[PDB]
Amino acid sequence: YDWRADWVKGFPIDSSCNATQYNQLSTGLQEAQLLAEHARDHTLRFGSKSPFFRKYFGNETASAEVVGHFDNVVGADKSSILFLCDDLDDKCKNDGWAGYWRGSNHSDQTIICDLSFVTRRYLTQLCSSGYTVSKSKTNIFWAGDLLHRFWHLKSIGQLVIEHYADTYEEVLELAQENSTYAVRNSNSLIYYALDVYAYDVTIPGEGCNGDGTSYKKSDFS
């Protein structure tokens, strides 16, 4: 039983979406996977010696679950997940809703409404038009929004990631008070992934955190 020839590592898309919607959903999913892979590599290279790990997860925490989450996002068997473009539950009629989760009856199914195709931006436009990681909402780009949607599925989240703190300040206090629960928090992982990507690639050596802190090479050891 060669299981290396049956391994699917990309997110499937249903046939409800036409060519135009498929073209942009594929790019968004690929960008989300690229962000997750970079976060995994940064964690593996540094650990708790980097100042970004120490401020989102704890001063002396172990980096095993953190790398495992992004490893599951990057490489795993996505043979049951399906993304649909059809409103099968009558919920896109709400205000400001760009998608939703089908629930417990269909735990590996997600629906995308038409607001996503007009409001979401791409990774080449990061830290532009006044965007900052700590003062803007995390769902402005395709990568952050789709990462947030990934934690709901049964094959990725596995019913352990939840919402314990949502605002930036609450995330910062969770990092220092309850270090066990701030590795399974939805917002901490997305903040970390968005913060370490703008420091290595977008603006090397500076980033766009926008909260009044600057990190040098001497802080990484």
* Cβ pair 142, 119 in contact under 8 A: no
> Contact between 155 and its own copies (CB under 8 A)?
yes
Rule CB under 8 A: which of 109-148 touch its own copies? 117-118, 122, 124-129
Q: Give the total residue count for the chain.
A: 221
Kindly determine how many residues on this chain lie close enough to bind its own copies according to the rule CB under 8 A: 46
Taking the complex as a whole, how short is the minimal distance between the CB of residue 167 and its own copies, in angstroms? 25
Taking the complex as a whole, how short is the minimal distance between the CB of residue 131 and its own copies, in angstroms? 10
Backbone angles phi, psi at 148, to 5 degrees: -60, -40
> Contact between 103 and its own copies (CB under 8 A)?
no
The residue from 20, 94, 167, 214 that contacts its own copies (CB under 8 A) is: 20
Which is nearer to its own copies, 128 or 213 (by Cβ)? Answer: 128
User: Could you give the C-alpha distances from 32 to 2, 6, 148, 197, in angstroms and in order?
Assistant: 29, 23, 10, 12
Which is nearer to its own copies, 24 or 107 (by Cβ)? Answer: 24
Q: What is the pairing mode between strands 109-112 and 82-84?
A: parallel
- Single out the segment in contact with its own copies by CB under 8 A; choices: 23-31, 90-98, 105-113, 164-172: 23-31
Backbone angles phi, psi at 48, to 5 degrees: -90, 5
Residue type, 196: V
> Contact between 163 and its own copies (CB under 8 A)?
no
Taking the complex as a whole, how short is the minimal distance between the CB of residue 89 and its own copies, in angstroms? 25
* Cα–Cα dist 187/174, whole Å: 11
121 beta partners: 141
Where would I find the H helices in the chain? 19-46, 51-56, 65-74, 116-119, 142-150, 168-177, 186-197
Taking the complex as a whole, how short is the minimal distance between the CB of residue 66 and its own copies, in angstroms? 7
Which residue ranges make up the site for its own copies (CB under 8 A)? Answer: 1, 3-4, 7, 19-20, 23-24, 27, 44-47, 62-69, 71-72, 75-77, 117-118, 122, 124-129, 155, 158-160, 202-206, 217, 220
